Design an enzyme around this catalytic site. Sequence first.
Site, PDB file in Angstrom:
ATOM      1  N   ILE B  27      28.555 -36.967   1.538  1.00  0.00           N
ATOM      2  CA  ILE B  27      28.302 -35.257   1.160  1.00  0.00           C
ATOM      3  C   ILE B  27      29.275 -34.502   1.904  1.00  0.00           C
ATOM      4  O   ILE B  27      29.225 -33.328   1.724  1.00  0.00           O
ATOM      5  CB  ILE B  27      26.859 -35.092   1.921  1.00  0.00           C
ATOM      6  CG1 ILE B  27      26.791 -35.134   3.607  1.00  0.00           C
ATOM      7  CG2 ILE B  27      25.799 -35.923   1.644  1.00  0.00           C
ATOM      8  CD1 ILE B  27      25.442 -34.883   4.384  1.00  0.00           C
ATOM      9  N   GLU B  29      33.558 -34.491   2.759  1.00  0.00           N
ATOM     10  CA  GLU B  29      34.960 -35.479   2.723  1.00  0.00           C
ATOM     11  C   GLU B  29      36.096 -34.453   3.284  1.00  0.00           C
ATOM     12  O   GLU B  29      36.677 -33.580   2.323  1.00  0.00           O
ATOM     13  CB  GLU B  29      35.516 -35.929   1.510  1.00  0.00           C
ATOM     14  CG  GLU B  29      36.436 -37.052   1.705  1.00  0.00           C
ATOM     15  CD  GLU B  29      36.628 -37.655   0.349  1.00  0.00           C
ATOM     16  OE1 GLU B  29      36.071 -37.283  -0.880  1.00  0.00           O
ATOM     17  OE2 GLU B  29      37.329 -38.807   0.294  1.00  0.00           O
ATOM     18  N   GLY B  30      36.307 -34.297   4.612  1.00  0.00           N
ATOM     19  CA  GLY B  30      37.351 -33.453   4.967  1.00  0.00           C
ATOM     20  C   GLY B  30      38.626 -34.163   5.277  1.00  0.00           C
ATOM     21  O   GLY B  30      38.746 -35.467   5.291  1.00  0.00           O
ATOM     22  N   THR B  31      39.597 -33.321   5.896  1.00  0.00           N
ATOM     23  CA  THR B  31      40.826 -34.264   6.297  1.00  0.00           C
ATOM     24  C   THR B  31      40.586 -35.015   7.648  1.00  0.00           C
ATOM     25  O   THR B  31      41.210 -35.993   7.718  1.00  0.00           O
ATOM     26  CB  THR B  31      41.958 -32.877   6.668  1.00  0.00           C
ATOM     27  OG1 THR B  31      42.012 -32.204   5.559  1.00  0.00           O
ATOM     28  CG2 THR B  31      43.247 -33.548   7.152  1.00  0.00           C
ATOM     29  N   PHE B  32      39.578 -34.473   8.596  1.00  0.00           N
ATOM     30  CA  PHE B  32      39.467 -35.289   9.773  1.00  0.00           C
ATOM     31  C   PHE B  32      38.142 -35.922   9.858  1.00  0.00           C
ATOM     32  O   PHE B  32      37.679 -36.145  11.113  1.00  0.00           O
ATOM     33  CB  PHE B  32      39.758 -34.400  10.846  1.00  0.00           C
ATOM     34  CG  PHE B  32      41.218 -33.810  10.613  1.00  0.00           C
ATOM     35  CD1 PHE B  32      42.404 -34.675  11.472  1.00  0.00           C
ATOM     36  CD2 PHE B  32      41.588 -32.410  10.334  1.00  0.00           C
ATOM     37  CE1 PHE B  32      43.566 -34.043  11.255  1.00  0.00           C
ATOM     38  CE2 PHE B  32      42.688 -32.162  10.279  1.00  0.00           C
ATOM     39  CZ  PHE B  32      43.790 -32.782  10.632  1.00  0.00           C
ATOM     40  N   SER B  33      37.374 -36.068   8.989  1.00  0.00           N
ATOM     41  CA  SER B  33      35.957 -36.760   8.958  1.00  0.00           C
ATOM     42  C   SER B  33      35.359 -36.928   7.647  1.00  0.00           C
ATOM     43  O   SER B  33      35.926 -36.460   6.580  1.00  0.00           O
ATOM     44  CB  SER B  33      35.006 -35.696   9.833  1.00  0.00           C
ATOM     45  OG  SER B  33      34.110 -34.822   8.898  1.00  0.00           O
ATOM     46  N   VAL B  35      31.437 -37.259   6.163  1.00  0.00           N
ATOM     47  CA  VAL B  35      29.773 -37.044   6.478  1.00  0.00           C
ATOM     48  C   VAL B  35      28.902 -37.706   5.560  1.00  0.00           C
ATOM     49  O   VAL B  35      29.183 -37.601   4.364  1.00  0.00           O
ATOM     50  CB  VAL B  35      29.517 -35.679   6.688  1.00  0.00           C
ATOM     51  CG1 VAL B  35      27.975 -35.648   7.063  1.00  0.00           C
ATOM     52  CG2 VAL B  35      30.421 -35.066   7.661  1.00  0.00           C
ATOM     53  N   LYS B  53      28.401 -38.352  10.769  1.00  0.00           N
ATOM     54  CA  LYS B  53      29.692 -37.780  10.860  1.00  0.00           C
ATOM     55  C   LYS B  53      30.659 -38.852  11.324  1.00  0.00           C
ATOM     56  O   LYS B  53      30.433 -39.134  12.637  1.00  0.00           O
ATOM     57  CB  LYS B  53      29.778 -36.459  11.404  1.00  0.00           C
ATOM     58  CG  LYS B  53      31.048 -35.774  11.393  1.00  0.00           C
ATOM     59  CD  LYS B  53      31.193 -34.658  11.945  1.00  0.00           C
ATOM     60  CE  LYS B  53      32.867 -33.938  11.757  1.00  0.00           C
ATOM     61  NZ  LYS B  53      32.372 -32.352  12.284  1.00  0.00           N
ATOM     62  N   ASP B 140      35.941 -22.379  13.414  1.00  0.00           N
ATOM     63  CA  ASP B 140      36.044 -22.518  11.720  1.00  0.00           C
ATOM     64  C   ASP B 140      34.667 -21.979  11.286  1.00  0.00           C
ATOM     65  O   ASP B 140      33.873 -22.729  10.779  1.00  0.00           O
ATOM     66  CB  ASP B 140      36.152 -23.921  11.964  1.00  0.00           C
ATOM     67  CG  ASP B 140      36.589 -24.439  10.386  1.00  0.00           C
ATOM     68  OD1 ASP B 140      36.871 -23.607   9.654  1.00  0.00           O
ATOM     69  OD2 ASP B 140      36.334 -25.496  10.138  1.00  0.00           O
TER      70      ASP B 140
HETATM   71  N1  LIG Z   1      23.480 -32.065   9.873  1.00  0.00           N
HETATM   72  C1  LIG Z   1      24.010 -31.969   8.758  1.00  0.00           C
HETATM   73  N2  LIG Z   1      23.172 -31.866   7.748  1.00  0.00           N
HETATM   74  C2  LIG Z   1      23.312 -31.512   6.362  1.00  0.00           C
HETATM   75  N3  LIG Z   1      24.513 -31.590   5.918  1.00  0.00           N
HETATM   76  C3  LIG Z   1      25.663 -31.628   6.734  1.00  0.00           C
HETATM   77  C4  LIG Z   1      25.247 -31.787   8.355  1.00  0.00           C
HETATM   78  N4  LIG Z   1      26.521 -32.160   8.925  1.00  0.00           N
HETATM   79  C5  LIG Z   1      27.413 -32.042   8.132  1.00  0.00           C
HETATM   80  N5  LIG Z   1      27.074 -31.533   6.734  1.00  0.00           N
HETATM   81  C6  LIG Z   1      27.794 -31.616   5.407  1.00  0.00           C
HETATM   82  O1  LIG Z   1      28.861 -32.144   5.675  1.00  0.00           O
HETATM   83  C7  LIG Z   1      29.942 -31.162   5.621  1.00  0.00           C
HETATM   84  C8  LIG Z   1      31.094 -31.741   6.357  1.00  0.00           C
HETATM   85  O2  LIG Z   1      30.486 -31.819   7.664  1.00  0.00           O
HETATM   86  P1  LIG Z   1      31.446 -30.997   9.106  1.00  0.00           P
HETATM   87  O3  LIG Z   1      30.945 -31.430  10.238  1.00  0.00           O
HETATM   88  O4  LIG Z   1      31.574 -29.546   8.476  1.00  0.00           O
HETATM   89  O5  LIG Z   1      32.915 -31.672   8.777  1.00  0.00           O
HETATM   90  P2  LIG Z   1      34.506 -31.405   8.885  1.00  0.00           P
HETATM   91  O6  LIG Z   1      34.540 -31.071  10.197  1.00  0.00           O
HETATM   92  O7  LIG Z   1      35.157 -32.350   8.353  1.00  0.00           O
HETATM   93  O8  LIG Z   1      34.382 -30.026   8.245  1.00  0.00           O
HETATM   94  C9  LIG Z   1      29.428 -30.013   5.895  1.00  0.00           C
HETATM   95  O9  LIG Z   1      30.050 -28.564   5.248  1.00  0.00           O
HETATM   96  C10 LIG Z   1      27.997 -30.042   5.221  1.00  0.00           C
HETATM   97  O10 LIG Z   1      27.973 -29.582   3.987  1.00  0.00           O
HETATM   98  F1  BEF Z   2      36.323 -29.061   7.727  1.00  0.00           F
HETATM   99 BE1  BEF Z   2      35.451 -28.569   9.029  1.00  0.00          BE
HETATM  100  F2  BEF Z   2      34.857 -27.413   8.522  1.00  0.00           F
HETATM  101  F3  BEF Z   2      36.563 -28.873  10.046  1.00  0.00           F
HETATM  102 MG   LIG Z   3      35.364 -29.333  11.365  1.00  0.00          MG
HETATM  103 MG   LIG Z   4      33.186 -28.269   8.516  1.00  0.00          MG
END
Ligand SMILES: Nc1ncnc2c1ncn2[C@@H]1O[C@H](COP(=O)(O)OP(=O)(O)O)[C@@H](O)[C@H]1O
Ligand code: BEF
Ligand SMILES: [Mg+2]
Ligand SMILES: [Mg+2]
Lengths: 103, 340
Positions: B27, B29-33, B35, B53, B140
């Site tokens: 759900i 797919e970021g550069t650094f994680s 989920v 995550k 952010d």
């Molecule tokens: N606790 C959660 N419940 C539902 N969706 C989540 C949750 N945590 C993350 N997500 C989904 O995963 C995406 C990426 O998680 P996030 O922690 O924002 O990672 P990043 O640091 O890579 O941006 C979020 O934008 C959201 O759509």
């Molecule tokens: F991309 Be997450 F919002 F670091």
């Molecule tokens: Mg982030």
């Molecule tokens: Mg994020």
Amino acid sequence: GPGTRTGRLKKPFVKVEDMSQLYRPFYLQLTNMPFINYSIQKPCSPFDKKGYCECCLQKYEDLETHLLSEQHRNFAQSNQYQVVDDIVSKLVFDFVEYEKDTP
Amino acid sequence: AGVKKDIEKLYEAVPQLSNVFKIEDKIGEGTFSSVYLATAQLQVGPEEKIALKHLIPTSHPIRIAAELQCLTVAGGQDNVMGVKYCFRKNDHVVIAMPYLEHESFLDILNSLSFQEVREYMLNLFKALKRIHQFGIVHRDVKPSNFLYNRRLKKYALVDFGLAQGTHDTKIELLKFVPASLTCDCYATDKVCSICLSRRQQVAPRAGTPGFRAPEVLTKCPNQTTAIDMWSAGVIFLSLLSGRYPFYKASDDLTALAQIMTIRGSRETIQAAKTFGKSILCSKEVPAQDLRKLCERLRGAGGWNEVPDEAYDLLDKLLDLNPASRITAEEALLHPFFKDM
Ligand SMILES: Nc1ncnc2c1ncn2[C@@H]1O[C@H](COP(=O)(O)OP(=O)(O)O)[C@@H](O)[C@H]1O
Ligand code: BEF
Ligand SMILES: [Mg+2]
Ligand SMILES: [Mg+2]
Ligand SMILES: [Zn+2]
Ligand SMILES: [Zn+2]
């Protein structure tokens, strides 16, 4: 111009400089500066792998390659993650854990 | 297939997950994680959906732990996401959070009502008030990091991977996260070999450029919790105008030029002086009236009755001066939120 590294920025431009004059200025030059377009339909904007490993203190050209390198595996298996484990020790595990499935 | 292999690799990287979680989908797919959505059984509760995550294993342990500590210390209340558990195997750390099913911001805009806008902003400010009370600068704030469930009226600020601490932060781990010459090009359209040869100014990493405050875009060394309030104002601007992303820029100075077309070039230049930045803009652009801007962008007919208080709050959130910019605690007391 370019030869002397001296001259004037072609317009239009934006120029940002720290007031202490300690750092190189930042420049932006575009053919056209941004224009608020009200005619473009909503929700459109009106203005319409390589990395660094903090553990190894090392640049890398491909993540999967770097994760398998000897220096990274050495860090990964070290005691450097105790700071993470000390937070986890305060959390309560409340999920059901299954035995491994076997034929 | 591509997601199926990612899930298989995650189970391989942290084998304990195989005996606890049924990992259903990817759900994030970021550069650094990455989920993942998973199903788990609670020992003394029902079955639960869980967000897993997986942090990029090139992250330093202190940065991993600081993100986890924001969730453990500040999370779980006032619309700030909390954490259930954290699984580690060597350099692979997986944070397990309760999964909040949520709307995409484009879907929010598609069925938005005025009262929903009020409730969304109110609950965003509750979360920002709480993290700012702990001395966390999120850095952010944007819709993908603020989860909204329309059916439940439930909200969660997530993602502390870029957070920094204030000087008096209550998150302990956030504390642990030739010569330059003057020239006469200052405040002119000139360059010379002196100013061009200076080193680059550096600043902490922030999020998406279209949500960065002017003091972030100009690499000010002092960046406060006010930068999160600017980002909240950008979300509000999207809600009121119906446009998302509002600022469409992949680099800092393009975003700044777009901001100047909204808030005024002369106004931005004057504000930047107060945080130690000289800005020169060859094409002067006037500040826009925010009501007229949002009404013309959103369409007429019918949302023409938005109260003055909404645009007044938007003006205070998008204050170009980070010192006078409204705080989260003040935003909750603003007349826009009368009776809530
Ligand atoms: N606790 C959660 N419940 C539902 N969706 C989540 C949750 N945590 C993350 N997500 C989904 O995963 C995406 C990426 O998680 P996030 O922690 O924002 O990672 P990043 O640091 O890579 O941006 C979020 O934008 C959201 O759509
Ligand atoms: F991309 Be997450 F919002 F670091
Ligand atoms: Mg982030
Ligand atoms: Mg994020
Ligand atoms: Zn490494
Ligand atoms: Zn110069």
